Structures are given as structure tokens and as C-alpha cells.
């Protein structure tokens, strides 16, 4: 076989899960957050996949 | 087989799940948030997939 | 087989779920949010798939 | 088989769900939000798939 | 076989999970956060995959 | 002060919430159930406060 | 002060929450269930407060 | 002070939370269940407070 | 002071939390369950407070 | 002071937490279970407080 990509690719066979991202956010997984009190200014309480590039 | 992509591709066979994103947000997964009190200015309480690029 | 894409594609066979996004938001998954009080100015309380690019 | 796309495509066979988006928003999944009080100016309380690009 | 990529690629066969990211965040895994009180200004309470590049 | 009860009482001062039950069911709290498929004969899918005394 | 009870009482002062139960079920708390598939005969999927006394 | 109870009592002062139960179930706490697939006959998947006295 | 109980009592002062139970189940605490697949016949997957007295 | 109990009592002063149980189950503590696959017939996967007296 032959393949040429510029990116971003994701090429496969017999594949149970696939995610391609440029951005941006993708949530595909099981996630449970239980929480009782959030205070403070300002605290990232429960972050799973996170990116902060403030300018 | 032969394939040429510019991106972003996601090419496969026999594949249970697929996500392609440029952006942007995609939520495809099970997610449960239970929460009782959020305060503060300003706190990211429960973030799963998150991207902040303020300018 | 042969395939040429510019992107964004999502090409497959025998595939249970598919999402293609450029944008933008796509919500296809099970999601439960239970919440009792949100305060503060301004706090992202419960974000699952999120993108903030304010200019 | 043969396929050439410009994007955004989503090509498949035997496929239970499909979403193609350029935009924009698509909601196809089960979603339950229960909520008791939202205050503050201005707090994104419960966001599932979200994109904010204010200029 | 032959392959030439510019990156970022992810090329495979017989592959159970795949993630390609440029960004950005991708959450595909099981995650449980249980939490009782978050205070302080400002403390990253529970971060799993995290990136902070404030300027 | 003086108090004599037979039960069931609930006596208080300065009290934000109160529930008295003999029975029976009382639901006063925030509750979010999101659900996609229930099968089987017969499975209690999502029970929060539950009592089964079949004879 | 003086108090005589037969039960079940709940006597207090300056008290934020109170529950008295004989039964029976009382749900006063925040609860989020997100769920995607329930099968089997018969499986208690997600039980929070539960009592089964079948005869 | 003086107190005589038969039970079940719960007597206090300056008390943030109170639960009295004879039964029966009481759910007053924050709870998040996220779940993707339940099978089998019959499996208690996610039980928090649970009592099974089948006869 | 003087106190005579038959049980079950719970007598206190200046007390943040109280639970009295005869039964039965009481859930007052923060709880997060995230789960992806439950199979088998029949397996207690995730049990927090649990009592099984089948006859 | 004077006290006579039959049991089960729990008598105190200046006390942050209290639990009295006859039964039965009480869950008052923070608990996080994250889990990916449960199989087998039948295996107690993750048990925190547990009692099995099958007859």
C-alpha cells in the first residue's frame, strides 16, 4: 500500500476508536465528576483535558 | 490501496467510533457531572475537554 | 481501493458512529448535569467540550 | 472502490450514526440538565458542546 | 509498503485506540473525580492532562 | 424549653431544609438522569432513593 | 431544656438540613446519572440509596 | 439538660446536617455516576448505599 | 446533664454531621463512579456501602 | 454527668462527624471509583465497605 499525508491524518484498519483533533476539544470517554463546593478566584477545580494559552 | 490526504483526514475500516475535528468541540462520550455549589470569580469548576486562547 | 481527500474527511466501513466537524459544536453523547447553585462572575461551572477564543 | 472529496465528507457503510457539520451546532445525543439556581454576570453554567469566538 | 508524512500522522493496522492531537485537548479515557471542597486563589485542584502557557 | 414527641417529629430553629416522611417518598433535591437504552426483565436501571418490599 | 421522645425524632437548633424517615425513601441531594446501555435480567445498574426486602 | 429517648433519636445543637432513618433509604449527598454499558444477569453495577435481604 | 437511651441514639453538641440508621441505607457523602463496561453474572462492580443477607 | 445506654448509642460533644448504624449501610465519605472493564462470574471488583452473609 501507499500513503502520503500532510497532517494531521489518522489512518488505520480494524480499529475500535479514532480521534483526530486540531483545535479545540474532543471528549469521547467516560467521565464522572461529583463535587460539593468550589470557591476561590480563580481555581481550576477538576480539569481532565485542558489547555490555557491566554495572551 | 492508495491514499493521499491534505489533512485532517481519518481513514479506516471496521471501526466502531470516529471523530474528526477542526475547531471547535465534539462531545460523543458518556459524561456525568453532579455539583452542589460554584462560587468565585472566576473558577473553571469541572472542565472535561477545554481550550482557552483569549487574546 | 483509492482515495484522495482535501480534508476534513472521515472515510470508513462497518462503523458504528461518525462525527465530522469544522466549527462549531457537535454533541452526540449521553450527558447528565445536575446542579444546585452557580454564582460568581464569571465561572465556567460544568463544561464538557469547550473552546473559547475571544479577541 | 474510488473516492475523491474536497471536504467535509463522511463516507461509510453499515453505519449506525453520522454527523457532518460546518458551522454551527448539531445535537443528536441524550442530554439531561437539572439545575436549581444560576447567578453571576456572566457564567457559563452547564455547557456541553460550546464554541465562543467573540471579536 | 511506502509512507511519507509531514506530521502529525498516526498510521497503523489492527489498532484498538488512536488519538491525534494538535492543540488542544482530547479526553478518551475513563475518569472519576470525587471532591468535597476547593478553596484558595488559585489552586489547580485535580488536573489530569493539563497545559498552561499564559503570556 | 420543653418538648415531648411520639414520633416522627422534626423540631428545629434557623433551619434551611426539612423533610419528614412516613411512607412513602419525598423528592426535594436536584436530580438529572440522562439515559440512552434500558433493556432486560427486569433491571432497576437508575434508582436514587428506593425501597422494595414485595410480599 | 428537657426532651422526651418515642422515636423517631430529630431535634436541633441552627441546623442547615434535616431528614426524618420511616419507610420509605427521601432524596434531597444532588444526583447526576448519565448512562448509555442497560441490559441483563436483572441487574441493579446504578443504585444510590437502596433497600430490597423481597419475601 | 435532660433527655430520654426510645430510639431512634438524633439530638444536637449547631449542627449542619442531620439524617434519621429506619427503613429504607435516604440520599442527601452529591453523587455522580457515569456509565457506558451494563450487561450480565444480574450484576450490581454501581451501588453506593445498598441493602439486600431477599427471603 | 443526664441521658438515658434505648438505642439507637446519636446525641451531641456543636456537630457538623450526623447520621442515624437502622435498616437500610443512608448516603450523605460525595461519590463519583465512572465506568465503561460491566459484564458477568453476577459481579458486584463498584460497591461503596453494601450489605447482602440473602436467605 | 450521667448516662445509661442499651446500645447502640454514640454520645459526644464538640464533634465534627457522627455515624450510628445497625444494618445496613452508611456512606458519608469521599469516594472515587474509575473503572474500565469488569468481567467474570462473579467477582467483587471494587468494594469499599462490604458485608456478605448469604445463607
Curated annotation (Swiss-Prot), chains A, B, C, D, E, F, G, H, I, J:
Any one GO molecular function term: SNARE binding
Record keywords: Acetylation, Alzheimer disease, Amyloid, Cell projection, Copper, Cytoplasm, Disease variant, Membrane, Metal-binding, Neurodegeneration, Nucleus, Parkinson disease, Parkinsonism, Phosphoprotein, Repeat, Secreted, Synapse, Ubl conjugation
GO terms classed as biological process: adult locomotory behavior; amyloid fibril formation; behavioral response to cocaine; cellular response to copper ion; cellular response to epinephrine stimulus; cellular response to fibroblast growth factor stimulus; cellular response to oxidative stress; chemical synaptic transmission
Sequence repeats: 1-12, 13-23
Residues found modified as Phosphoserine: 43
Annotated positions binding Cu cation: 6
Gene Ontology CC: one annotated term: mitochondrial inner membrane
Result, substituting residue 9 to T: In PARK1; no effect on osmotic stress-induced phosphorylation; increases oligomerization
Tissue: Highly expressed in presynaptic terminals in the central nervous system. Expressed principally in brain.
Compartment annotation: Cytoplasm; Membrane; Nucleus; Synapse
Free-text description of this protein's post-translational modifications in UniProt: Phosphorylated, predominantly on serine residues. Phosphorylation by CK1 appears to occur on residues distinct from the residue phosphorylated by other kinases.
Disease per record: Genetic alterations of SNCA resulting in aberrant polymerization into fibrils, are associated with several neurodegenerative diseases (synucleinopathies). SNCA fibrillar aggregates represent the major non A-beta component of Alzheimer disease amyloid plaque, and a major component of Lewy body inclusions. They are also found within Lewy body (LB)-like intraneuronal inclusions, glial inclusions and axonal spheroids in neurodegeneration with brain iron accumulation type 1. Parkinson disease 1, autosomal dominant: A complex neurodegenerative disorder characterized by bradykinesia, resting tremor, muscular rigidity and postural instability. Additional features are characteristic postural abnormalities, dysautonomia, dystonic cramps, and dementia. The pathology of Parkinson disease involves the loss of dopaminergic neurons in the substantia nigra and the presence of Lewy bodies (intraneuronal accumulations of aggregated proteins), in surviving neurons in various areas of the brain.
Domain notes: The 'non A-beta component of Alzheimer disease amyloid plaque' domain (NAC domain) is involved in fibrils formation. The middle hydrophobic region forms the core of the filaments. The C-terminus may regulate aggregation and determine the diameter of the filaments.
UniProt record similarity statement: Belongs to the synuclein family.
Subunit structure: Soluble monomer. Homotetramer. A dynamic intracellular population of tetramers and monomers coexists normally and the tetramer plays an essential role in maintaining homeostasis. Interacts with UCHL1. Interacts with phospholipase D and histones. Interacts (via N-terminus) with synphilin-1/SNCAIP; this interaction promotes formation of SNCA inclusions in the cytoplasm. Interacts with CALM1. Interacts with STXBP1; this interaction controls SNCA self-replicating aggregation. Interacts with SNARE components VAMP2 and SNAP25; these interactions allows SNARE complex assembly and integrity.
Function: Neuronal protein that plays several roles in synaptic activity such as regulation of synaptic vesicle trafficking and subsequent neurotransmitter release. Participates as a monomer in synaptic vesicle exocytosis by enhancing vesicle priming, fusion and dilation of exocytotic fusion pores. Mechanistically, acts by increasing local Ca(2+) release from microdomains which is essential for the enhancement of ATP-induced exocytosis.
Protein name: Alpha-synuclein
